[PDB]
Design a protein around this ligand. Sequence first.
Ligand SMILES: C=C(C)[C@H]1CN[C@H](C(=O)O)[C@H]1CC(=O)O
Length: 249
Amino acid sequence: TLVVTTILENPYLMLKGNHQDMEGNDRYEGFCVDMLKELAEILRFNYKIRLVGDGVYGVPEANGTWTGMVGELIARKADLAVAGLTITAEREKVIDFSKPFMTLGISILYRKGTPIESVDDLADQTAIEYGTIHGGSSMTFFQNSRYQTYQRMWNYMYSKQPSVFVKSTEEGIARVLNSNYAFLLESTMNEYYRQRNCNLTQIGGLLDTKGYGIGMPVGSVFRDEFDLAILQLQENNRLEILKRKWWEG
Ligand SMILES: C=C(C)[C@H]1CN[C@H](C(=O)O)[C@H]1CC(=O)O
């Protein structure tokens, strides 16, 4: 029985409408749940879904401790982390990842009727505030960039009061709809919320290209076979079908 650490995040992992009449794994739906099922049909493992204790994906502390689902993996509190867990060079030093099961990049979200046409335009004006989830992969992309536009954006987000950071994707989307705030978020989420809210638009293109991956502790015995199953899923178009099931509505 594999212990899977995860987090509530639309549409990867959600509580079913009538989740109180459910127990254990069957409380939950979504793309990651459907992916787990298909992976489990090939590889024949049982698993139990457990929501990350601290409610975070993963941030390094200055002393070397990781938080979030990354930390749970290093502590061996979970065998797998199944979420929109962005594969980055910093995380790769401290855990293993499967091959990627979805592609994405940093994107900008805003409410319609705007003359903001790009990330350089966004960074070069004062009227519209902008920001991201604190401690996520997108934040650290600006924080460590050598490019001046992104450096200027880091300096702004860092210093602005009141804070331009949000604690969740839900919090950011709400800030977009209700205030003059453009949200720095992964394109997967951008596509999702745009399809459910005709008022939302994308500013410019994608700022990078990345992957989500199943997180595992470093040296995990399960990595090889999960890579073999993900490839079979990829080559049978399963990951794409599932993405359409959860995104296109
Ligand atoms: C906090 C969330 C929603 C996660 C999801 N992927 C990124 C990560 O795994 O860090 C984070 C989002 C972002 O950085 O824009």
